[PDB]
Ligand binder design. Structure first.
Ligand SMILES: CSC[C@H]1O[C@@H](n2cnc3c(N)ncnc32)[C@H](O)[C@@H]1O
Ligand SMILES: CSC[C@H]1O[C@@H](n2cnc3c(N)ncnc32)[C@H](O)[C@@H]1O
Lengths: 300, 301, 325, 325
């Protein structure tokens, strides 16, 4: 059985949203804790003095539900590495605010994107939240296998996509991650949420992630092919990647809208259960070793 | 009048129709419920008072942007990932949903009707730009030209294959769908707003995240530090020689001339200025909406 | 440490789950409104009530229930410095309370109040009464209380008792951490539901604070000597700490075992350990000294046993434990 | 840390033993008095001078020598928070200075000044310019400066340079102490007369402060990225820190090696170490990030190398080193 989550960026009513998601068979919901478009000002009047509540109430869910069913998401307007000083400062204050609300809610995990090369100040703000107060939330860094710049359609007449091999360049998002966790001092609380695209990179790029703390794999509905009966399926190569991820016992995250509209949403989940049930059974050694994976012991 | 009992605090959009009726779009960006609403005021002075609207309707999610589709249609950019078409009933007393298509994988941020008025273009946080056939209610083409969130899309006033896009990947793209490679890169600080010049076919203006407004010619740049923060919108006046309204997150409104020089300034808004619309009846009257729930009617000198 | 730290949602949920406590504050507010506003003035006289450290709103609701039962007019201010709790209060204000309640997102020591208060209501008390810094907070809020203004609580007192417990002594011993002084675990108090222990002498009052604080050039620092008669042979491992508070007149709350408020579980006793166990013979007196110290940044306790034998002074200068201001 | 700590008599004696420094401040005051008071007003116009952090009195004497040479009338206030230095100033005031000098025993951020100043004179600068908290102190004193008032110094800037030194790296390594994080010695700056080292790239400006601070809602926090071109093969062990200050107009003080004030020894360079040495090939760029952080109690620096390889962020949240406010 797979542990799965639903990634949503639009949650009109939490209780209605969680219920719908859980009926579909998901174990958790990744959602914004402040409205993703609700940009807040911290320095300049009059906007810094904006009234009313800044977000929805913690009273909307039981404490058990916040602790178990909700993965917080950082607002997409928060840019701590912006080239604009005012944007950097508002982002720092907004990032601390969102992280602190997450810690207030007792969220098991919180998603932060690694979507560019320089994340120095995002790492400084996270490292500072980690050393402030008493909390133990996991931080899941959302990082793509292939950078959006490297998978764009070759449709810009005067800015063509490079057809030549860039061995180290195709591994760039691993370096985004490596630099981020080096800055943060290998904190046990910082993990990878690996995002999977329609076109898989070459093997060496995938193998770069071997030995990395992958806690989740993000599967967009758009990467799924359609079978004879209209159900979402994966290419033999994506299936190969899923089998490796299931061995690591990652939590799967389904992102985007239903692109298999004629069929129900849980079909994406059903396909993952199918792959999970259709993997090789554990041999005598594998059944014995269960629970000992990466568990350090003193030699007898 | 069959409309919701109360409209949401965060006014996102304001657009006058050729007769002078005012279209409003709102979202609740805080509190328990994060939904939205579409409103029509045949009496714009009554706005935003719900008990004095001509028609009003509640949407499932927030209104990130909207546009008129002729005189009766209302195209909506939804937080849900949907692009929705709504239409005023034959009595203009009810806003009825025509289509709700979930084609985008994240918030639909920007929406624009092409010159023919038969097709539209959407932009999203999912990094894609889509071309819609409004009568068939389908996506004709989907484009992943960008490497980050699509901030703004603006259809050419007069060319049905031409549009602009700008994004957090620092690209401004000029599109011509007749081309095998439809996008072309034009050309700093991130581009946040776009407006084609109403008279000069090859001229457009763009706003940036640092408060700068720029004048750009395709065939061939003029620039001014208009705002202290992000330029949210740019709307040219309906005059023979247009005036240019700029709105920002600095909570101000500036009305500029052909040389980008400031003629008018308003600090009426207590929160972010979201949309501006020039009156089709009184060319000196400009209406702005903001997150402070104010509908301000400005008299421009 | 609700002043230094922002309390989590589930911590506030625990506080709120104590009905006895809130019915006591409601009773104290009810009595105070009746003594401040005569029947003839009930429609004219609006009392300005200020909840200082409102949390998620139980004291705001207790004040509103109190005004309804007293049939007196109130104007409420809900002051909270934790912006995460402010979200809860602001959602309550829009949905339930309305204009009657003004939510203020601020530290009570910094807040420029628009008008003076008739009553200030707070629950800034710890297990040792003043260990959460209620004296410093309420001294900072005092200038916005009217000359005839009332503070609920009006008074609080801490109590100490010598205890024997080789079980708890070992529990403190096991709190040795790396990158700190190897004995720092003994120089800090612990909140603990004391179970396997022996109370060696009856609890005696340690420190008292009164609000409003009348005396000019106020000093929250203190030095107390306590002499505990011991009737048994034993081993001293530390001091159990409790408190009592006067909300208003005869309405009180207590965690002192002999006067414990029935059914109230908001506070467990505190434990001030000692580094070395001390032998006590029957008929001997245990003499303990406690200091409440501070600077502009921190508050802390220092303590020592001076009879039957001396201990070292524990936590000198807050080197192992401080309470953030 | 002269703000947090009271400097000893012999520490002040060391400062005073630098004639170049005081003749520079005297020259800056002399020039300022001549620009502020025209010849015709020399008998009518008395300038209110305030020495903020007067120590044992060298800036008071430099101000008096400056007024005598400019032939302008001055009214001096000598502000000092260290009461041990106040004894020296008060003995000087009774014996030498007289009524002309008013000694004030107070923190400049708390002092209720009886009148506004024409000129505020201070020497609150450390080896990294702002590391002794001159920005916070002078921001707190600003309200008592006249609208056209002058601050001496008027500006200061810190500089950084990558350095190689296996000798200093080992010296930091040997600073491991018990009862603290085993790597805390690498997350704190040191004042050091750097001798056996290699400067890897020319010093570049890091942080700048201007006084009076004109901008509303002042922020002393900062984030700087510096790119250092490297022409040699080497090993990076840390960053040498220096400063420059504009006392008045063209009158300056500098410890930046290329512009060093001749004969001035009041400040040695600062050293920001890194935990792990970093290999640098010729032609590579060293990229360093520095933050100046704070809360209401403390100020600190955080730093990291992001090229040719990443280091961990050093001193996150001031966990190893803070500057007391
Ligand atoms: C019910 S526990 C005490 C409550 O008072 C709040 N609090 C403590 N000290 C202050 C203060 N100085 N100003 C405002 N609220 C305070 C805390 O954040 C908490 O919600
Ligand atoms: C010459 S070193 C700096 C001098 O200024 C003093 N000082 C530093 N900060 C302050 C302050 N905030 N108020 C008054 N004196 C200060 C120190 O005690 C020292 O004598």
């Amino acid at each position: 059985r797979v542990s799965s989550g639903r990634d949503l960026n639009c949650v009109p009513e939490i209780a209605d949203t969680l219920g719908a998601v859980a009926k579909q068979g998901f174990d958790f919901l990744c959602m914004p804790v402040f409205h993703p478009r609700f940009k807040r000002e911290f320095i300049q009047e009059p906007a810094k003095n904006r009234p009313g509540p800044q977000t929805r109430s913690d009273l909307l869910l039981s404490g058990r539900d916040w602790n178990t069913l909700i993965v917080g998401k950082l607002s997409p307007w928060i840019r701590p590495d912006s080239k604009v000083e005012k944007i950097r400062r508002n982002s720092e204050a907004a990032m601390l605010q969102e992280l602190n609300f997450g810690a207030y809610l007792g969220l098991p995990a919180f998603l932060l994107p690694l979507n560019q090369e320089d994340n120095t100040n995002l790492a400084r703000v996270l490292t500072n939240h980690i050393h402030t107060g008493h909390h133990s939330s996991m931080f899941w860094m959302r990082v793509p296998l292939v950078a959006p710049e490297d998978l764009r359609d070759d449709i810009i007449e005067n800015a063509p996509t490079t057809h030549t091999e860039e061995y180290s360049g195709e591994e760039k998002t691993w370096m985004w991650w490596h630099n981020f966790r080096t800055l943060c001092d290998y904190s046990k609380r910082i993990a990878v949420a690996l995002e999977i695209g329609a076109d898989l990179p070459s093997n060496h790029v995938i193998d770069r992630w071997l030995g990395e703390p992958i806690k989740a794999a993000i599967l967009p509905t758009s990467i799924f092919l359609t079978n004879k009966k209209g159900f979402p399926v994966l290419s033999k190569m994506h299936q190969r990647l899923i089998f490796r991820l299931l061995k690591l016992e990652v939590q799967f995250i389904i992102t985007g809208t239903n692109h298999h509209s004629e069929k129900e949403f849980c079909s994406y989940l059903q396909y993952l259960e199918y792959l999970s049930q259709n993997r090789p059974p554990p041999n005598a050694y594998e059944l014995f070793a269960k629970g000992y994976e990466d568990y350090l012991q003193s030699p007898l | 009048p069959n409309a919701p009992a109360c409209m949401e605090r965060q006014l996102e959009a304001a657009r006058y129709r050729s007769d002078g009726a005012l279209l409003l779009g709102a979202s609740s960006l805080s509190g328990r419920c994060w939904a939205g609403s579409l409103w029509l005021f045949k009496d714009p002075c009554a706005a935003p008072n719900e008990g004095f609207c001509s028609a009003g309707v509640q949407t499932e999610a927030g209104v990130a942007d909207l546009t008129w589709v002729g005189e009766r249609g209302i195209l909506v950019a939804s937080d849900s990932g949907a692009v929705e078409l709504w239409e005023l009933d034959e009595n203009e007393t009810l806003i009825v949903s025509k289509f709700c298509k979930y084609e985008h994988d994240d918030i639909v941020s920007t929406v624009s009707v092409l010159s023919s008025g038969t097709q539209a273009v959407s932009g999203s946080k999912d990094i894609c730009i889509k071309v819609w056939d409004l009568a068939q209610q389908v996506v004709l083409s989907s484009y992943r030209a960008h490497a980050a969130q699509v901030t703004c899309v603006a259809a050419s006033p007069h060319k049905d294959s031409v549009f602009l896009s700008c994004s957090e990947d620092n690209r401004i793209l000029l599109w011509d769908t007749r081309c095998p490679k439809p996008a072309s890169q034009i050309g700093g600080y991130l581009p946040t707003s776009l407006a084609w010049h109403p008279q000069q076919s090859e001229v457009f203006v763009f706003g940036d995240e640092n408060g700068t407004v720029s004048l750009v010619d395709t065939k061939s740049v003029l620039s001014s530090a208009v705002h202290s923060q992000c330029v949210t919108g740019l709307v040219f006046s309906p005059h023979s020689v247009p005036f240019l309204a700029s709105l920002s997150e600095d909570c101000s409104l500036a009305v500029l001339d052909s040389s980008l020089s400031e003629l008018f300034r308003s600090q009426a808004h207590r929160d972010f200025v979201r949309d501006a619309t020039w009156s089709p009846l009184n060319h000196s009257l400009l209406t702005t909406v903001g997150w402070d729930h104010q509908v301000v009617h400005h008299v421009v000198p | 440490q609700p002043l230094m730290d922002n309390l989590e949602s589930q911590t506030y949920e625990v506080f709120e789950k104590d009905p006895i406590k809130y019915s006591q504050y409601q009773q104290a507010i009810y009595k105070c409104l009746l003594d401040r506003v005569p029947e003839e003035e009930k429609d004219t006289n609006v009392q300005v009530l200020m909840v200082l450290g409102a949390g998620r709103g139980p004291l705001v609701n207790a004040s509103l229930r109190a005004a309804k039962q007293a049939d007196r007019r109130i104007k409420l201010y809900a002051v909270e410095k934790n912006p995460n709790a402010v979200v809860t209060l602001e959602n309550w204000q829009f949905e339930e309370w309305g204009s009657q309640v003004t939510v203020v997102s601020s530290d009570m020591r910094e807040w420029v109040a628009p008008e003076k208060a008739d009553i200030i209501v707070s629950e800034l008390l710890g297990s040792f009464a003043d260990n959460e810094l209620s004296p410093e907070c309420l001294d900072g809020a005092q200038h916005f209380l009217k000359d005839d203004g009332v503070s609920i609580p009006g008074e609080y007192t801490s109590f100490l008792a010598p205890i024997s417990s080789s079980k708890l002594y070992n529990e403190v011993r096991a709190c040795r951490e790396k990158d700190r002084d190897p004995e720092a675990q003994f120089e800090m108090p612990y909140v603990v539901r004391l179970h396997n222990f022996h109370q060696l002498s009856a609890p005696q009052p340690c420190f008292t604070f009164s609000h409003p604080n009348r005396d000019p050039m106020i000093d929250n620092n203190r030095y107390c000597t306590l002499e505990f008669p011991v009737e048994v042979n034993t081993v001293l491992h530390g001091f159990a700490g409790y408190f009592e508070t006067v909300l208003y007149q005869d309405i009180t709350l207590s965690i002192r075992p002999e006067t414990h408020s029935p059914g109230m579980f908001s506070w467990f006793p505190i434990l001030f350990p000692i580094k070395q166990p001390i032998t006590v013979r029957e008929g001997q007196t245990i003499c303990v000294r406690f200091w409440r110290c501070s600077n502009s940044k921190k508050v802390w306790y220092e303590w020592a046993v001076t009879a039957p034998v001396c201990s070292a002074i524990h936590n000198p200068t807050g080197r192992s434990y401080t309470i953030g201001l």
